Tab-separated table of N, CA and C and ligand atoms in Angstrom:
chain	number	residue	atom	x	y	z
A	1149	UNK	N	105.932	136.388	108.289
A	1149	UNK	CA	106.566	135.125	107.961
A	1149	UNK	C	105.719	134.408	106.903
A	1150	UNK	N	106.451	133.866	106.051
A	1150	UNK	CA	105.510	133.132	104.831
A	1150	UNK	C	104.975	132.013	105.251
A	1151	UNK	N	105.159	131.009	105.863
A	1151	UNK	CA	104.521	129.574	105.975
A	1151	UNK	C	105.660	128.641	106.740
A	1152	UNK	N	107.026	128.827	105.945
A	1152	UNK	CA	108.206	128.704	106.405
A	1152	UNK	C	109.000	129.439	106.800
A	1153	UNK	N	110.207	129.767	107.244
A	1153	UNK	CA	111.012	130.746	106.371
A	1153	UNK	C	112.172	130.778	105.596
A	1154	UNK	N	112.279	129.797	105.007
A	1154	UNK	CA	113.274	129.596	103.209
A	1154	UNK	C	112.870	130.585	102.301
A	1155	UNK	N	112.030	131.187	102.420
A	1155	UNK	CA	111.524	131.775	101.367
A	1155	UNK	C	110.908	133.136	102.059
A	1156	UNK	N	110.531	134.193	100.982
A	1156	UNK	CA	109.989	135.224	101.643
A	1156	UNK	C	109.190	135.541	102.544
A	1157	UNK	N	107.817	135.656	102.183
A	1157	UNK	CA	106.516	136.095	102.589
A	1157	UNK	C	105.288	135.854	101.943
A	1158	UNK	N	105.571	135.912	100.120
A	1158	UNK	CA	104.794	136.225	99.131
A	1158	UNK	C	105.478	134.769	98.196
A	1159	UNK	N	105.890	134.177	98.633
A	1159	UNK	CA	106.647	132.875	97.255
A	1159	UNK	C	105.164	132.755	96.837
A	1160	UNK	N	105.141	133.383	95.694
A	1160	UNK	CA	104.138	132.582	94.512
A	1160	UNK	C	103.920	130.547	94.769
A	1161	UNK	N	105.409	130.788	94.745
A	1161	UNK	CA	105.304	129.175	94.669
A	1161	UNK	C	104.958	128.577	95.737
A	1162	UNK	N	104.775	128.766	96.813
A	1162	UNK	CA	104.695	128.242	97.959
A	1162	UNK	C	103.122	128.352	98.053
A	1163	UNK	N	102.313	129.689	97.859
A	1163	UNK	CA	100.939	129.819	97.438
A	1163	UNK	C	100.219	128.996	97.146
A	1164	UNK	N	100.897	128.189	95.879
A	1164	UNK	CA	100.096	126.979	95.057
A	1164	UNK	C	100.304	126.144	96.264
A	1165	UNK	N	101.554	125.321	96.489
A	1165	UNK	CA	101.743	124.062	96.735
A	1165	UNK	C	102.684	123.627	98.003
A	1166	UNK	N	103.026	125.204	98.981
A	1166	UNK	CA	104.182	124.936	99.720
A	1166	UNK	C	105.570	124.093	99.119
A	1167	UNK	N	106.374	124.761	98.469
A	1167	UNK	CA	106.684	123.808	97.132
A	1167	UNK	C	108.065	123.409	98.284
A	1168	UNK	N	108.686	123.397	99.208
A	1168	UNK	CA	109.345	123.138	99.868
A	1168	UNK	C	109.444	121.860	100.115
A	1169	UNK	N	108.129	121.185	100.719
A	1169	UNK	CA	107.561	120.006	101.118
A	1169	UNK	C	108.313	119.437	102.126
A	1170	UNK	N	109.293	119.854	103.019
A	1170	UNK	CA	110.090	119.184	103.679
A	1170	UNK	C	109.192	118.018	104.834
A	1171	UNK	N	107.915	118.553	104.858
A	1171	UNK	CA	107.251	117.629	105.750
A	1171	UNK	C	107.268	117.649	107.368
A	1172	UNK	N	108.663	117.571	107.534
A	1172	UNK	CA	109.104	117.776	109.017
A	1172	UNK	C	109.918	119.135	108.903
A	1173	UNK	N	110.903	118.922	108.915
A	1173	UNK	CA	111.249	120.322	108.559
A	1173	UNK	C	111.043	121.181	107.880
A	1174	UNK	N	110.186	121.399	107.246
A	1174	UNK	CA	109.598	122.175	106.164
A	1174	UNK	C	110.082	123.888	106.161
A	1175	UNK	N	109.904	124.174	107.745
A	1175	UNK	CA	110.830	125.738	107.978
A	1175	UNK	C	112.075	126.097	107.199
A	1176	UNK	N	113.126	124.938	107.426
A	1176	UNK	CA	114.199	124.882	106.654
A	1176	UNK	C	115.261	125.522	107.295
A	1177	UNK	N	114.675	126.728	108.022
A	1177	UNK	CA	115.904	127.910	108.624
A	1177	UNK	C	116.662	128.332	107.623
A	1178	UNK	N	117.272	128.094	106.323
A	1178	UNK	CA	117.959	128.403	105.566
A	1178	UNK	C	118.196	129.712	104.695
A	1179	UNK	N	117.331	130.520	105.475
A	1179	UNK	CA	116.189	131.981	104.200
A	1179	UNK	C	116.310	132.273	103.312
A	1180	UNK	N	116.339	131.187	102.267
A	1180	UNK	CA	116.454	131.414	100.839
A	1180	UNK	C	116.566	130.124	100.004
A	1181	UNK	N	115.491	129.315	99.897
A	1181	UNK	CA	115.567	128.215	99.283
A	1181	UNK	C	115.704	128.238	97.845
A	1182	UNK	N	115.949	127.537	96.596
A	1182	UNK	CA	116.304	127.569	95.006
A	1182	UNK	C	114.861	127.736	94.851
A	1183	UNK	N	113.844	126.727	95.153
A	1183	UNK	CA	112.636	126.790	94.651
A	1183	UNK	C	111.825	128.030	94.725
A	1184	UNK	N	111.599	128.475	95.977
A	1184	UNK	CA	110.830	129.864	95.474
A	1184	UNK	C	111.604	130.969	95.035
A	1185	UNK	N	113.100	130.774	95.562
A	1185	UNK	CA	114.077	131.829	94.463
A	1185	UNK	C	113.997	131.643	92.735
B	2050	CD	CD1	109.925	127.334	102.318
B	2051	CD	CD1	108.121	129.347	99.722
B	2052	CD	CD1	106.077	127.230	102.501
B	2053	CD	CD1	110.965	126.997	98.668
């Protein structure tokens, strides 16, 4: 599991900055957010 799971495993972007930021929900459940797509 990457950190969340909107996103892969490996989001570059998430690496830097968790670029999600949802704060509270940050998981999202959604598995596939725009940003690290
Ligand atoms: Cd995410
Ligand atoms: Cd991510
Ligand atoms: Cd994340
Ligand atoms: Cd994301």
């Amino acid at each position: 599991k990457s950190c969340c799971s909107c996103c892969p495993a490996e989001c570059e972007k998430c690496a830097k900055d968790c670029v999600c930021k949802g704060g509270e929900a940050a998981e999202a459940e959604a598995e596939k957010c725009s940003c690290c797509q």
